[PDB]
Design a protein around this ligand. Sequence first.
Ligand SMILES: [Cl-]
Length: 163
Amino acid sequence: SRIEREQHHLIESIEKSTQYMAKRRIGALISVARDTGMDDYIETGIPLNAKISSQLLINIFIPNTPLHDGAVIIKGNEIASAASYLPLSDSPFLSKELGTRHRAALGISEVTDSITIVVSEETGGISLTKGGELFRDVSEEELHKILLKELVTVTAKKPSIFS
Ligand SMILES: [Cl-]
């Protein structure tokens, strides 16, 4: 448990799972809690309290399965819940071409500092919401830089479990 290792593993787990789902046009909605709490939305889903892995993220979103219909919420170093409610944005600025997953990702971003990642089941495009804004159809490089900037808070320092 060396925080920096955990944060980089989280980034890699999001990258690998979203890449897998994007190629197959599997819809996905993954919200990562930061300083603002997501606890009430965690309570709306199915509790997992699971180790983060790309494999589990993929298995969650397989269509027509018990865990797929809603958001995954990641809290600290766990996949806290699946099939969670997120508030829908009412914004008329969000394109009508985008679906409920994007509107849900935009809505949680308007009321928390969470970072939310969407895979479109229509296009396979990957999008990201933060602070009421949408980053639509980001490339792999762009997704990587954003996740690095927003989910990694520690620089090169001495590894220690007590960090
Ligand atoms: Cl979608």
